[PDB]
Short mmCIF file of C-alpha atoms in Angstrom, two decimals:
data_model
loop_
_atom_site.label_atom_id
_atom_site.label_comp_id
_atom_site.label_asym_id
_atom_site.label_seq_id
_atom_site.Cartn_x
_atom_site.Cartn_y
_atom_site.Cartn_z
CA UNK A 1 -29.42 -30.11 -34.17
CA UNK A 2 -26.98 -28.87 -31.56
CA UNK A 3 -26.64 -32.29 -30.24
CA UNK A 4 -25.23 -33.16 -26.63
CA UNK A 5 -22.02 -35.39 -25.79
CA UNK A 6 -20.66 -37.15 -22.24
CA UNK A 7 -17.24 -37.56 -22.01
CA UNK A 8 -15.93 -39.79 -19.58
CA UNK A 9 -13.24 -38.33 -17.76
CA UNK A 10 -10.14 -38.77 -15.70
CA UNK A 11 -10.49 -35.63 -12.47
CA UNK A 12 -6.90 -33.54 -12.13
CA UNK A 13 -5.75 -33.00 -7.93
CA UNK A 14 -4.30 -30.35 -9.13
CA UNK A 15 -7.28 -28.03 -9.19
CA UNK A 16 -7.24 -25.62 -6.85
CA UNK A 17 -8.56 -21.85 -7.40
CA UNK A 18 -7.16 -19.37 -5.29
CA UNK A 19 -7.87 -15.89 -4.94
CA UNK A 20 -7.45 -14.97 -8.22
CA UNK A 21 -8.96 -18.16 -10.08
CA UNK A 22 -6.92 -20.96 -11.43
CA UNK A 23 -3.49 -20.31 -12.76
CA UNK A 24 -1.44 -23.05 -14.11
CA UNK A 25 0.72 -23.65 -16.72
CA UNK A 26 0.00 -23.30 -20.22
CA UNK A 27 1.85 -26.35 -20.97
CA UNK A 28 -0.24 -27.94 -18.43
CA UNK A 29 -3.70 -27.20 -20.52
CA UNK A 30 -2.55 -28.59 -23.58
CA UNK A 31 -0.53 -30.94 -22.58
CA UNK A 32 -3.64 -32.77 -19.96
CA UNK A 33 -6.77 -33.43 -21.27
CA UNK A 34 -9.80 -32.26 -20.21
CA UNK A 35 -8.24 -30.21 -17.81
CA UNK A 36 -10.16 -27.25 -18.90
CA UNK A 37 -13.12 -28.65 -19.75
CA UNK A 38 -13.76 -30.32 -15.92
CA UNK A 39 -12.61 -27.36 -14.39
CA UNK A 40 -15.51 -25.00 -16.87
CA UNK A 41 -17.58 -28.03 -16.29
CA UNK A 42 -16.78 -28.10 -11.88
CA UNK A 43 -17.67 -24.29 -12.13
CA UNK A 44 -21.40 -25.01 -14.01
CA UNK A 45 -21.77 -28.05 -11.58
CA UNK A 46 -22.00 -25.80 -8.52
CA UNK A 47 -25.53 -23.99 -10.28
CA UNK A 48 -28.49 -26.43 -8.92
CA UNK A 49 -29.59 -28.06 -11.98
CA UNK A 50 -33.28 -26.24 -11.45
CA UNK A 51 -31.82 -23.16 -11.96
CA UNK A 52 -29.51 -23.75 -15.17
CA UNK A 53 -32.19 -22.25 -17.30
CA UNK A 54 -32.89 -18.99 -15.88
CA UNK A 55 -29.19 -18.08 -15.48
CA UNK A 56 -26.82 -16.13 -16.86
CA UNK A 57 -22.81 -16.12 -17.24
CA UNK A 58 -21.02 -13.55 -17.62
CA UNK A 59 -17.22 -14.01 -19.86
CA UNK A 60 -14.56 -12.16 -20.07
CA UNK A 61 -11.34 -12.01 -21.93
CA UNK A 62 -8.45 -9.98 -23.62
CA UNK A 63 -9.45 -12.21 -27.72
CA UNK A 66 -5.97 -17.82 -27.97
CA UNK A 67 -8.37 -17.09 -25.21
CA UNK A 68 -11.50 -16.76 -28.27
CA UNK A 69 -11.14 -21.09 -28.15
CA UNK A 70 -11.47 -20.78 -24.64
CA UNK A 71 -14.61 -19.21 -24.49
CA UNK A 72 -15.94 -21.72 -27.61
CA UNK A 73 -15.05 -24.40 -24.82
CA UNK A 74 -17.64 -22.43 -21.98
CA UNK A 75 -20.20 -22.27 -24.42
CA UNK A 76 -20.56 -25.44 -25.51
CA UNK A 77 -20.03 -26.74 -21.97
CA UNK A 78 -22.34 -24.88 -20.90
CA UNK A 79 -25.41 -25.46 -23.46
CA UNK A 80 -25.17 -29.20 -22.95
CA UNK A 81 -25.62 -28.24 -18.89
CA UNK A 82 -28.79 -26.59 -19.57
CA UNK A 83 -27.44 -22.97 -19.15
CA UNK A 84 -29.84 -20.80 -21.00
CA UNK A 85 -27.72 -17.52 -21.37
CA UNK A 86 -24.32 -15.89 -22.11
CA UNK A 87 -23.06 -12.80 -21.86
CA UNK A 88 -19.81 -12.07 -23.85
CA UNK A 89 -18.26 -9.60 -25.52
CA UNK A 90 -17.40 -8.97 -29.26
CA UNK A 91 -13.94 -10.61 -30.25
CA UNK A 92 -13.83 -12.05 -26.91
CA UNK A 93 -13.31 -8.47 -25.04
CA UNK A 94 -14.58 -7.82 -21.90
CA UNK A 95 -12.39 -6.09 -18.93
CA UNK A 96 -13.36 -7.25 -15.57
CA UNK A 97 -14.55 -4.31 -14.36
CA UNK A 98 -16.17 -4.59 -17.77
CA UNK A 99 -17.39 -8.21 -16.28
CA UNK A 100 -18.26 -7.06 -12.45
CA UNK A 101 -20.24 -4.10 -14.61
CA UNK A 102 -22.99 -6.43 -16.57
CA UNK A 103 -23.02 -9.34 -14.13
CA UNK A 104 -24.93 -6.39 -11.44
CA UNK A 105 -26.84 -5.06 -13.98
CA UNK A 106 -28.65 -7.76 -15.80
CA UNK A 107 -28.46 -10.16 -12.76
CA UNK A 108 -26.92 -12.53 -13.54
CA UNK A 109 -25.67 -15.43 -11.70
CA UNK A 110 -21.79 -14.85 -12.57
CA UNK A 111 -19.41 -15.13 -14.93
CA UNK A 112 -16.26 -16.49 -15.91
CA UNK A 113 -13.06 -14.68 -16.67
CA UNK A 114 -10.26 -15.73 -18.34
CA UNK A 115 -6.66 -14.51 -17.76
CA UNK A 116 -3.21 -15.12 -19.86
CA UNK A 126 0.36 -18.94 -17.82
CA UNK A 127 -3.57 -18.84 -18.59
CA UNK A 128 -6.05 -18.13 -16.20
CA UNK A 129 -10.02 -19.00 -15.39
CA UNK A 130 -11.77 -17.21 -12.83
CA UNK A 131 -15.73 -17.74 -11.66
CA UNK A 132 -17.49 -14.57 -9.94
CA UNK A 133 -20.65 -14.67 -8.38
CA UNK A 134 -24.26 -13.08 -8.68
CA UNK A 135 -22.49 -10.02 -6.52
CA UNK A 136 -20.18 -9.16 -9.38
CA UNK A 137 -16.76 -10.14 -6.79
CA UNK A 138 -14.29 -13.26 -6.97
CA UNK A 139 -16.14 -16.94 -5.28
CA UNK A 140 -15.39 -16.44 -1.74
CA UNK A 141 -13.58 -18.82 -0.29
CA UNK A 142 -16.50 -21.54 0.00
CA UNK A 143 -17.38 -21.74 -3.24
CA UNK A 144 -14.01 -21.72 -4.51
CA UNK A 145 -13.62 -24.90 -2.23
CA UNK A 146 -16.41 -26.79 -3.77
CA UNK A 147 -15.29 -25.95 -7.27
CA UNK A 148 -12.31 -27.60 -6.40
CA UNK A 149 -14.00 -31.00 -4.45
CA UNK A 150 -16.12 -31.41 -7.45
CA UNK A 151 -12.65 -30.89 -9.54
CA UNK A 152 -11.30 -33.42 -7.85
CA UNK A 153 -13.75 -36.17 -7.85
CA UNK A 154 -15.95 -35.37 -12.20
CA UNK A 155 -16.00 -38.77 -13.90
CA UNK A 156 -17.77 -36.95 -16.79
CA UNK A 157 -18.81 -33.73 -18.74
CA UNK A 158 -21.23 -32.60 -21.12
CA UNK A 159 -20.14 -30.55 -24.09
CA UNK A 160 -21.96 -30.15 -27.27
CA UNK A 161 -19.49 -30.99 -29.49
CA UNK A 162 -20.28 -29.37 -32.53
CA UNK A 163 -21.46 -26.06 -31.32
CA UNK A 164 -19.92 -22.64 -32.56
CA UNK A 165 -20.20 -18.75 -31.40
CA UNK A 166 -19.82 -16.32 -33.86
CA UNK A 167 -17.85 -13.72 -31.22
CA UNK A 168 -17.40 -11.27 -34.09
CA UNK A 169 -21.41 -9.77 -34.34
CA UNK A 170 -23.28 -8.30 -31.64
CA UNK A 171 -26.60 -9.20 -30.86
CA UNK A 172 -28.62 -12.81 -29.54
CA UNK A 173 -27.65 -15.76 -31.61
CA UNK A 174 -29.30 -18.68 -30.51
CA UNK A 175 -29.30 -22.80 -30.61
CA UNK A 176 -31.61 -25.66 -30.79
CA UNK A 177 -29.74 -28.36 -28.75
CA UNK A 178 -31.30 -31.93 -29.12
CA UNK A 179 -33.76 -33.15 -26.44
CA UNK A 180 -33.97 -29.62 -24.96
CA UNK A 181 -37.14 -27.53 -25.70
CA UNK A 182 -35.78 -23.80 -24.73
CA UNK A 183 -32.70 -22.62 -26.74
CA UNK A 184 -29.64 -21.96 -25.45
CA UNK A 185 -28.58 -18.59 -26.03
CA UNK A 186 -25.61 -15.92 -26.42
CA UNK A 187 -25.85 -12.55 -26.55
CA UNK A 188 -22.29 -10.78 -27.94
CA UNK A 189 -21.80 -7.36 -26.59
CA UNK A 190 -20.45 -4.24 -27.86
CA UNK A 191 -17.25 -4.24 -25.34
CA UNK A 192 -17.01 -0.76 -24.28
CA UNK A 193 -20.81 0.19 -23.91
CA UNK A 194 -22.40 -1.20 -20.67
CA UNK A 195 -18.88 -0.06 -18.75
CA UNK A 196 -19.01 3.22 -20.58
CA UNK A 197 -22.39 4.29 -19.81
CA UNK A 198 -22.04 3.20 -15.45
CA UNK A 199 -19.05 5.24 -15.71
CA UNK A 200 -21.04 8.49 -18.02
CA UNK A 201 -23.10 8.79 -14.75
CA UNK A 202 -19.88 7.76 -11.67
CA UNK A 203 -18.32 10.40 -13.39
CA UNK A 204 -18.95 14.49 -15.18
CA UNK A 205 -17.82 13.75 -18.35
CA UNK A 206 -18.14 17.32 -19.84
CA UNK A 207 -16.00 18.48 -17.25
CA UNK A 208 -13.23 15.81 -17.61
CA UNK A 209 -13.81 16.60 -21.63
CA UNK A 210 -13.01 19.93 -20.48
CA UNK A 211 -9.80 19.11 -18.67
CA UNK A 212 -8.61 16.74 -22.39
CA UNK A 213 -9.77 19.18 -24.67
CA UNK A 214 -9.40 22.97 -25.92
CA UNK A 215 -7.61 25.56 -24.20
CA UNK A 216 -5.51 24.68 -21.65
CA UNK A 217 -6.57 21.59 -21.80
CA UNK A 218 -4.64 18.91 -19.13
CA UNK A 219 -1.87 16.55 -21.18
CA UNK A 220 -2.35 13.26 -20.53
CA UNK A 221 -0.24 10.00 -21.30
CA UNK A 222 -1.46 6.44 -20.84
CA UNK A 223 -0.69 3.47 -21.21
CA UNK A 224 -2.50 0.52 -21.27
CA UNK A 225 0.20 -2.22 -21.35
CA UNK A 226 -0.91 -3.86 -23.90
CA UNK A 227 -4.12 -5.51 -22.14
CA UNK A 228 -7.49 -5.41 -21.67
CA UNK A 229 -8.08 -1.75 -20.35
CA UNK A 230 -6.40 -0.58 -24.19
CA UNK A 231 -9.81 -0.39 -25.77
CA UNK A 232 -11.83 1.05 -23.21
CA UNK A 233 -9.02 4.14 -22.73
CA UNK A 234 -9.90 4.99 -26.90
CA UNK A 235 -13.69 4.48 -26.49
CA UNK A 236 -14.16 6.79 -22.94
CA UNK A 237 -10.99 9.09 -22.56
CA UNK A 238 -10.13 9.52 -26.27
CA UNK A 239 -12.90 9.02 -28.83
CA UNK A 240 -15.47 10.04 -26.31
CA UNK A 241 -13.14 12.75 -23.72
CA UNK A 242 -11.72 14.05 -25.83
CA UNK A 243 -7.89 13.35 -25.01
CA UNK A 244 -6.02 13.39 -28.61
CA UNK A 245 -4.75 9.88 -29.36
CA UNK A 246 -1.81 10.68 -29.01
CA UNK A 247 -2.56 10.32 -25.23
CA UNK A 248 -2.72 6.70 -25.46
CA UNK A 249 0.00 4.40 -26.45
CA UNK A 250 -0.15 0.33 -26.21
CA UNK A 251 -3.63 0.33 -25.88
CA UNK A 252 -4.32 -2.70 -28.48
CA UNK A 253 -4.41 -6.01 -26.64
CA UNK A 254 -1.50 -8.27 -28.40
CA UNK A 255 -0.37 -11.80 -27.56
CA UNK A 268 6.10 -0.61 -19.22
CA UNK A 269 5.49 0.73 -16.24
CA UNK A 270 9.58 1.91 -16.19
CA UNK A 271 9.42 3.07 -20.07
CA UNK A 272 5.96 5.28 -19.31
CA UNK A 273 8.16 6.62 -16.14
CA UNK A 274 10.38 8.31 -18.82
CA UNK A 275 8.50 9.63 -21.04
CA UNK A 276 6.65 11.50 -18.07
CA UNK A 277 10.66 12.55 -17.19
CA UNK A 278 10.87 14.39 -20.80
CA UNK A 279 8.50 17.24 -18.48
CA UNK A 280 6.03 17.53 -21.36
CA UNK A 281 2.96 15.84 -19.75
CA UNK A 282 0.53 16.97 -16.70
CA UNK A 283 -1.00 13.39 -15.90
CA UNK A 284 0.09 10.16 -16.49
CA UNK A 285 -1.68 6.55 -15.78
CA UNK A 286 -0.19 2.81 -16.59
CA UNK A 287 -2.69 0.11 -16.70
CA UNK A 288 -1.91 -3.65 -16.30
CA UNK A 289 -2.94 -6.89 -17.51
CA UNK A 290 -3.83 -9.16 -15.75
CA UNK A 291 -4.79 -7.64 -12.43
CA UNK A 292 -7.02 -4.01 -12.62
CA UNK A 293 -4.23 -2.31 -11.24
CA UNK A 294 -3.57 1.20 -11.68
CA UNK A 295 -0.07 3.79 -11.47
CA UNK A 296 -0.83 7.51 -11.21
CA UNK A 297 1.43 9.78 -12.18
CA UNK A 298 2.30 13.94 -12.00
CA UNK A 299 4.99 16.07 -14.58
CA UNK A 300 8.11 15.56 -14.52
CA UNK A 301 7.60 11.66 -13.40
CA UNK A 302 6.40 12.49 -9.83
CA UNK A 303 4.94 9.17 -8.14
CA UNK A 304 2.29 8.87 -6.53
CA UNK A 305 2.33 6.03 -4.43
CA UNK A 306 -0.68 3.62 -4.12
CA UNK A 307 -1.35 4.31 -0.50
CA UNK A 308 -0.97 7.73 -1.06
CA UNK A 309 -3.17 7.79 -4.09
CA UNK A 310 -6.67 6.38 -2.34
CA UNK A 311 -5.84 8.88 0.40
CA UNK A 312 -6.35 11.96 -1.90
CA UNK A 313 -9.13 10.54 -3.62
CA UNK A 314 -10.31 10.13 -0.08
CA UNK A 315 -9.90 13.71 0.95
CA UNK A 316 -11.61 14.99 -2.12
CA UNK A 317 -13.87 12.61 -2.63
CA UNK A 318 -16.69 15.02 -2.89
CA UNK A 319 -15.09 15.86 -6.88
CA UNK A 320 -16.87 12.97 -8.17
CA UNK A 321 -20.59 12.77 -8.64
CA UNK A 322 -20.97 9.84 -7.47
CA UNK A 323 -20.29 10.14 -3.61
CA UNK A 324 -21.88 13.15 -3.74
CA UNK A 325 -24.73 10.98 -4.38
CA UNK A 326 -24.71 8.29 -2.57
CA UNK A 327 -22.71 9.37 0.99
CA UNK A 328 -19.21 7.76 2.16
CA UNK A 329 -20.60 4.80 3.67
CA UNK A 330 -16.69 3.96 4.84
CA UNK A 331 -13.17 3.54 4.20
CA UNK A 332 -10.62 0.54 3.79
CA UNK A 333 -7.15 -0.44 3.05
CA UNK A 334 -5.44 -3.96 3.28
CA UNK A 335 -3.32 -3.71 6.27
CA UNK A 336 0.51 -3.55 4.65
CA UNK A 337 -0.85 -0.43 2.88
CA UNK A 338 -0.37 2.71 4.63
CA UNK A 339 -1.98 4.35 7.00
CA UNK A 340 -2.02 7.74 4.86
CA UNK A 341 -5.92 7.19 4.47
CA UNK A 342 -6.47 6.47 7.85
CA UNK A 343 -5.20 10.18 8.53
CA UNK A 344 -7.89 11.68 6.58
CA UNK A 345 -10.48 9.23 7.88
CA UNK A 346 -9.61 9.90 11.67
CA UNK A 347 -11.06 13.26 11.00
CA UNK A 348 -14.14 12.24 9.45
CA UNK A 349 -17.19 10.29 11.84
CA UNK A 350 -16.28 8.16 8.61
CA UNK A 351 -14.49 4.39 9.72
CA UNK A 352 -11.87 2.84 8.31
CA UNK A 353 -11.62 -0.46 7.77
CA UNK A 354 -8.27 -2.91 7.52
CA UNK A 355 -8.61 -6.11 6.14
CA UNK A 356 -6.33 -8.97 5.06
CA UNK A 357 -4.13 -8.83 1.48
CA UNK A 358 -6.72 -9.42 -1.50
CA UNK A 359 -10.07 -7.95 -2.27
CA UNK A 360 -12.37 -10.51 -1.44
CA UNK A 361 -12.73 -8.96 1.97
CA UNK A 362 -13.44 -5.48 0.00
CA UNK A 363 -16.42 -7.01 -1.50
CA UNK A 364 -18.56 -8.21 1.79
CA UNK A 365 -17.99 -4.92 3.67
CA UNK A 366 -19.75 -3.08 0.24
CA UNK A 367 -22.19 -6.01 -0.19
CA UNK A 368 -22.68 -5.10 3.56
CA UNK A 369 -23.37 -1.20 3.11
CA UNK A 370 -20.06 0.05 4.64
CA UNK A 371 -17.33 0.64 2.36
CA UNK A 372 -17.22 3.14 -0.41
CA UNK A 373 -13.57 3.88 -1.30
CA UNK A 374 -10.57 1.38 -1.29
CA UNK A 375 -7.32 0.47 -1.81
CA UNK A 376 -3.97 -1.04 -1.76
CA UNK A 377 -0.40 -0.21 -1.50
CA UNK A 378 -0.28 -3.33 -4.47
CA UNK A 379 -1.95 -0.84 -7.49
CA UNK A 380 -5.55 -1.45 -6.44
CA UNK A 381 -7.96 1.49 -5.86
CA UNK A 382 -11.83 1.00 -6.33
CA UNK A 383 -15.05 1.99 -4.79
CA UNK A 384 -18.30 -0.09 -4.06
CA UNK A 385 -19.47 0.95 -8.14
CA UNK A 386 -18.53 -2.62 -8.72
CA UNK A 387 -16.94 -5.71 -6.60
CA UNK A 388 -13.66 -5.33 -8.56
CA UNK A 389 -10.70 -3.08 -8.32
CA UNK A 390 -11.22 -0.69 -11.56
CA UNK A 391 -7.73 1.33 -12.99
CA UNK A 392 -9.09 3.19 -15.31
CA UNK A 393 -11.84 4.13 -12.53
CA UNK A 394 -8.82 5.39 -10.36
CA UNK A 395 -7.66 8.13 -13.22
CA UNK A 396 -11.14 9.46 -13.94
CA UNK A 397 -11.60 9.51 -10.32
CA UNK A 398 -7.98 11.33 -10.46
CA UNK A 399 -8.81 13.75 -13.04
CA UNK A 400 -11.86 15.19 -11.31
CA UNK A 401 -10.09 15.57 -8.90
CA UNK A 402 -7.53 17.62 -11.08
CA UNK A 403 -10.45 19.79 -12.79
CA UNK A 404 -12.23 20.64 -10.01
CA UNK A 405 -8.37 21.41 -8.31
CA UNK A 406 -6.68 22.89 -10.97
CA UNK A 407 -3.01 21.97 -9.68
CA UNK A 408 -0.68 20.09 -10.93
CA UNK A 409 -0.52 16.35 -9.58
CA UNK A 410 2.66 17.41 -7.43
CA UNK A 411 1.06 20.16 -5.85
CA UNK A 412 -2.28 17.90 -4.65
CA UNK A 413 0.37 16.21 -2.80
CA UNK A 414 2.34 18.50 -0.90
CA UNK A 415 -0.90 20.24 0.08
CA UNK A 416 -2.16 16.81 1.58
CA UNK A 417 0.71 15.71 2.80
CA UNK A 418 0.94 19.18 4.78
CA UNK A 419 -2.17 19.08 5.83
CA UNK A 420 -2.41 15.96 7.16
CA UNK A 421 1.42 14.51 7.38
CA UNK A 422 3.47 12.72 5.23
CA UNK A 423 3.26 8.47 5.19
CA UNK A 424 6.93 7.62 4.05
CA UNK A 425 6.16 4.16 2.15
CA UNK A 426 8.32 1.42 0.63
CA UNK A 427 7.84 -2.17 0.23
CA UNK A 428 10.61 -4.25 0.21
CA UNK A 429 10.85 -7.49 -1.94
CA UNK A 430 13.23 -11.08 -1.79
CA UNK A 431 11.97 -13.18 -4.52
CA UNK A 432 13.05 -17.04 -3.59
CA UNK A 433 13.86 -15.68 -0.59
CA UNK A 434 15.08 -19.90 0.77
CA UNK A 435 11.95 -21.41 2.35
CA UNK A 436 13.37 -22.69 4.93
CA UNK A 437 15.18 -19.85 6.10
CA UNK A 438 12.23 -18.16 5.41
CA UNK A 439 9.86 -19.37 8.55
CA UNK A 440 11.94 -19.49 10.30
CA UNK A 441 12.97 -15.95 9.56
CA UNK A 442 9.11 -15.37 10.56
CA UNK A 443 9.07 -18.48 13.12
CA UNK A 444 11.53 -16.76 15.02
CA UNK A 445 10.72 -13.04 14.76
CA UNK A 446 6.78 -13.61 15.95
CA UNK A 447 8.11 -15.59 19.07
CA UNK A 448 10.50 -12.78 19.71
CA UNK A 449 7.14 -10.55 19.48
CA UNK A 450 5.17 -12.51 22.61
CA UNK A 451 7.98 -11.85 25.32
CA UNK A 452 5.93 -9.66 27.54
CA UNK A 453 9.24 -6.92 27.21
CA UNK A 454 8.45 -6.24 24.40
CA UNK A 455 5.90 -3.84 24.03
CA UNK A 456 7.40 -0.78 24.90
CA UNK A 457 10.92 -1.76 24.24
CA UNK A 458 12.60 1.65 21.97
CA UNK A 459 14.30 1.30 18.85
CA UNK A 460 17.58 3.75 18.24
CA UNK A 461 19.03 4.85 15.48
CA UNK A 462 19.94 7.52 13.67
CA UNK A 463 19.14 9.33 17.42
CA UNK A 464 15.61 8.78 16.17
CA UNK A 465 13.44 6.18 19.04
CA UNK A 466 10.63 4.24 17.98
CA UNK A 467 9.02 2.23 20.31
CA UNK A 468 7.27 -0.83 20.42
CA UNK A 469 3.30 -0.02 21.26
CA UNK A 470 1.69 -3.38 19.57
CA UNK A 471 3.60 -6.23 18.08
CA UNK A 472 0.70 -9.37 16.33
CA UNK A 473 0.48 -11.57 13.73
CA UNK A 474 -2.41 -9.78 11.99
CA UNK A 475 -6.24 -11.54 12.75
CA UNK A 476 -9.63 -10.81 10.44
CA UNK A 477 -12.73 -11.67 11.74
CA UNK A 478 -14.88 -11.52 8.60
CA UNK A 479 -17.96 -9.43 9.72
CA UNK A 480 -20.05 -10.74 7.04
CA UNK A 481 -19.19 -14.38 6.58
CA UNK A 482 -17.21 -15.55 9.55
CA UNK A 483 -14.89 -16.64 8.42
CA UNK A 484 -11.43 -16.46 10.84
CA UNK A 485 -8.05 -15.56 9.30
CA UNK A 486 -4.87 -15.93 10.81
CA UNK A 487 -1.12 -15.83 10.01
CA UNK A 488 -2.19 -12.68 7.54
CA UNK A 489 1.01 -10.71 8.73
CA UNK A 490 3.48 -9.21 11.16
CA UNK A 491 3.15 -5.89 12.75
CA UNK A 492 5.23 -3.67 14.83
CA UNK A 493 3.30 -0.85 15.44
CA UNK A 494 4.48 2.05 16.95
CA UNK A 495 3.46 4.69 19.08
CA UNK A 496 4.35 7.51 16.66
CA UNK A 497 2.24 5.65 13.89
CA UNK A 498 4.84 4.59 12.13
CA UNK A 499 4.88 0.67 11.27
CA UNK A 500 6.42 -2.28 10.16
CA UNK A 501 4.59 -5.11 8.83
CA UNK A 502 6.32 -8.91 7.44
CA UNK A 503 3.93 -11.09 4.49
CA UNK A 504 4.94 -14.58 3.00
CA UNK A 505 3.91 -14.95 0.11
CA UNK A 510 8.57 -22.52 -6.74
CA UNK A 511 10.54 -20.27 -4.35
CA UNK A 512 8.84 -18.17 -1.38
CA UNK A 513 8.58 -14.35 -1.73
CA UNK A 514 9.60 -12.24 1.34
CA UNK A 515 7.55 -8.68 1.56
CA UNK A 516 8.47 -5.97 3.92
CA UNK A 517 6.39 -3.25 4.62
CA UNK A 518 8.22 0.59 5.91
CA UNK A 519 5.09 3.38 6.94
CA UNK A 520 7.38 6.36 8.33
CA UNK A 521 4.98 8.86 9.53
CA UNK A 522 6.37 12.03 9.71
CA UNK A 523 4.09 15.68 10.34
CA UNK A 524 7.41 18.55 10.09
CA UNK A 525 6.90 20.47 6.89
CA UNK A 526 10.86 20.46 6.85
CA UNK A 527 10.96 16.86 6.53
CA UNK A 528 7.55 16.48 4.36
CA UNK A 529 9.06 16.75 1.32
CA UNK A 530 12.53 14.53 1.25
CA UNK A 531 13.53 11.33 -0.59
CA UNK A 532 12.20 8.75 1.46
CA UNK A 533 14.43 6.21 0.95
CA UNK A 534 16.42 8.59 3.10
CA UNK A 535 13.76 9.09 5.28
CA UNK A 536 12.77 5.80 5.82
CA UNK A 537 16.52 4.02 5.94
CA UNK A 538 15.97 3.87 9.71
CA UNK A 539 12.80 1.82 9.98
CA UNK A 540 14.50 0.00 7.19
CA UNK A 541 17.99 -0.66 9.39
CA UNK A 542 15.86 -1.53 12.65
CA UNK A 543 13.65 -3.54 9.98
CA UNK A 544 16.40 -6.29 9.34
CA UNK A 545 18.04 -6.40 12.77
CA UNK A 546 15.13 -7.14 14.48
CA UNK A 547 14.28 -10.27 11.75
CA UNK A 548 17.53 -10.96 11.37
CA UNK A 549 16.27 -11.43 7.77
CA UNK A 550 20.07 -11.02 6.37
CA UNK A 551 21.12 -14.21 8.56
CA UNK A 552 18.37 -16.24 7.37
CA UNK A 553 17.62 -15.47 3.91
CA UNK A 554 21.16 -14.94 2.61
CA UNK A 555 20.31 -11.62 1.13
CA UNK A 556 22.24 -8.34 1.74
CA UNK A 557 19.46 -6.19 -0.30
CA UNK A 558 15.65 -6.62 -1.31
CA UNK A 559 14.59 -8.30 -4.97
CA UNK A 560 12.51 -5.34 -6.23
CA UNK A 561 12.27 -1.50 -4.32
CA UNK A 562 8.73 -0.20 -4.75
#
């Protein structure tokens, strides 16, 4: 039956994957021959051929991406991969993909993103490390032939097993189409206390929530879990149906009707948390609050807390919770791959990034809807407003006022001369101990460096990861460089006084902001009076 053809191909050279997988211009894929074929083939050729018959791959996506899945099954089948697991209609969120790779003990998975992206995840359910990403790139630059089952067609709409007899192959090629939500919900159903949540969302004094899935993959998960299972009225979920916004959710919550709001992105499994009247829980505080109230979640009560982590530019709010506890705190470079290594070593339970990422060692990717159920679990046992919880937290731990300035499309030349001169400043033996002033506030440099991180799981040494100016009072200024160049400025000002814990943060952060711009001389090098985005 199903025939297997070998296609001669010309290898492409712009095919270096990246941390979130290969993301190139959609126009590049349609205007290039086999561009996707050689990459799906390169990914598959990383698996030793003896292992391909016992191997299963999980495929993720939104559901245009249906035809990328077809191309992936025709090359996986023809390469002797034994089985694929695909969500119904091509829909599987990557938190659900990670969950499934780990439960069924798969060799990894391929996740398709919309700009169109292709990402390969390995056996622990997390993104492929720099070795595996390099190997795909190495093979990709030299792939001269790829195999395909030209005539094979998967029915992505019918649940269950579909089998394919391959020519000159004895065992069949197997595709299993799974319900998009079942496995993910079942894992969540044991992490969390669903009866306590059903109660929090239905009935007498039910908590009123508003959830914006932003037309992404998490959409249907919201309808199955928060509405159908947990009982939230269906008006709680907007845009929960992927279709080929945070500001529109803040406006809604400024109306004051809802107790809790959240937004889920597309894309990169991020989450935004809000309280009544649009009170903003910033992501650095959010991980800290979960940390301080962690034992409301059945999962952590039963598995313990093996460690806390945050990326380096995240605020130190989470440190204040950890310093009080005998649990270690790890400070990682930006990116989520480092979190995964410490979870594989059983040293990390809860982690987060200022860039709206929150997670736990339940899987090996961020989980935006997981963070919402973590928040609602806390609201169920604390029985206070989201804002009253934050004020109680701040008054207990002090407040880490935090903001991120984004300078987009800065002049690369200036941007390099920006960092280079500033870093050269921070080596003069005088620097440490200097004092910066205005307005009658004083900050004293305690440490200053360019963040380096040695991975304890793999021995990667990640250098030049951000300039850090650390002050004796616990405040910090961090500079990072991320077509056109983006400069990121992070400001973290610690405040212990209750008379100061509840003022507007742009007001409280202005002195460090002014200090940051002077030391950096950013305006003179960027040519910029203000930043492009303030968060």
